[PDB]
């Protein structure tokens, strides 16, 4: 029942910044024998790695930047020049059995605005000929992630039947990419003409529009 609630949960910063977090238990874990602590990290797509141990003992990895502190009950991880690739999720764990973990903090760096490069895609032929017809719409390399999107079948708005999905930020160019996929049936599809997907971002008052009619059949 020994907790380790960690805070904050998320976090937006820029190249270089005092990224210092805390993990507070409901008992001691630093001074009571061999049990101390540790802060691991993990890039979305790989299991955690070692960074700290024994509460404040940097690993052979790449210390100096990251630093462990506090002991007994409340501890604190600290990295000063928030390196770019540092983006990841940070965790804390103790050892007084059953070894429990702290919530975890998502760390996403801030960068300059960027309008999404929208591109629309008509249903694949192989698909249409299967009663299924699904229109897709890509929004690449934009930031901030905040962004509303909407489809207008023959002008009207389409609510249900769409599945959106975002990619997390990358090291290369700290940006986001989202993908929208309005699905429907072969029938109703051919029942209409134009297919539009409008996006609203803070990068442009006026909504980014890309669409198409079936002028090629």
């Amino acid at each position: 029942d020994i907790v380790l609630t960690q805070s904050p949960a998320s976090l937006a910063v820029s190249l270089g910044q005092r990224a210092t977090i805390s993990c507070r238990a409901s008992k001691s874990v630093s001074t009571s024998g061999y049990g101390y602590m540790h802060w691991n990290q993990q890039k979305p797509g790989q299991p955690p790695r070692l960074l700290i141990y024994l509460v404040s003992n940097l690993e052979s990895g790449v210390p100096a930047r990251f630093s462990g502190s506090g002991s007994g009950t409340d501890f604190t991880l600290n990295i000063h020049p928030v390196e770019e690739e540092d983006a990841a999720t940070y965790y804390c764990q103790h050892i007084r059995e059953p070894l429990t973990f702290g919530g975890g903090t998502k760390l996403e760096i801030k960068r300059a605005d960027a309008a999404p490069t929208v591109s629309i895609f008509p249903p694949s032929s192989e698909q249409l000929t299967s009663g299924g017809a699904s229109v897709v719409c890509f929004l690449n390399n934009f930031y901030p992630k905040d962004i509303n999107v909407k489809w207008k079948i023959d002008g009207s708005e389409r609510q249900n039947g769409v599945l959106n999905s975002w990619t997390d930020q990358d090291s290369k160019d700290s940006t986001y990419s989202m993908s929208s996929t309005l699905t429907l049936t072969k029938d109703e599809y051919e029942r209409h003409n134009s297919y539009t997907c409008e996006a609203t971002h803070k990068t442009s008052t006026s909504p980014i529009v890309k669409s198409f009619n079936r002028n090629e059949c």
Binding site: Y34, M37, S165
Partner: protein, 218 residues
């Protein structure tokens, strides 16, 4: 060279028994540290399940006690996990580690292996190309895509032109309207090369031992 990588199934029917092995190389089990198991639910969740001391002694998480068990085989430097009475919350990624016995000091985490528990059969995925259609893109740099829709369960590996050229590729995380996963991948390739140089979509659904490449054209 302490290499430890877990292996087991990937999809299992609930209220059954899941049991995966973790093999370690470079070091010997009967030599130090505790060898535990840990699972991670969709973000914000990590849970220590239990361990096995080089001594051969074991300590389980009170939560999964009476439903778990950890054995080993000194002769093959590999330790195992047995979870019975599996439901749905038991769907997470599974990692094994060398969390130093006694308390903690220098851990070593496996790669991982996901395990989803469900009734859903195991269906493959049909891939569909995402060609453009002569615009102002047919002058600049064209963006092509590829759509994987309706397979079960995760994961799914997509690449572009068998790995050849990954610069400028965004593969989006799978979702589900019913009990089927759909996912998409995009690739922005230079306009002056599209038509001529062919582009091929690559997708493999291990679970169904599926493999599919899909060329793309106007």
């Amino acid at each position: 060279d302490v290499q430890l990588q877990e292996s087991g199934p990937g999809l299992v029917k609930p209220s059954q028994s899941l049991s995966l092995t973790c093999t370690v190389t470079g070091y010997s089990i009967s030599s130090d540290y505790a060898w535990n198991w840990i699972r991670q639910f969709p973000g914000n969740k990590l849970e220590w399940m239990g361990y096995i001391s080089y001594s051969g002694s074991t300590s389980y998480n009170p939560s999964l006690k009476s439903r778990i068990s950890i054995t080993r085989d000194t002769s093959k430097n590999q330790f195992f996990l047995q979870l019975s009475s599996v439901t749905t919350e038991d769907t997470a990624t599974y990692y094994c580690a060398r969390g130093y016995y006694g308390s903690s000091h220098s851990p070593v985490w496996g790669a991982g292996t996901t395990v989803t528990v469900s009734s859903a059969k195991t269906t493959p995925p049909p891939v569909y190309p995402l060609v453009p259609g002569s615009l102002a893109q047919t002058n600049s740099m064209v963006t092509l895509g590829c759509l994987v829709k309706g397979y079960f369960p995760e994961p799914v590996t997509v690449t572009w032109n068998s790995g050849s050229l990954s610069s400028g590729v965004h593969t989006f995380p799978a979702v589900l309207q019913s009990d089927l996963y759909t996912l998409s991948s995009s690739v922005t390739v230079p306009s002056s090369t599209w038509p001529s140089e062919t582009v091929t979509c690559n997708v493999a659904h291990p679970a169904s031992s599926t493999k599919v490449d899909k060329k793309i054209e106007p």
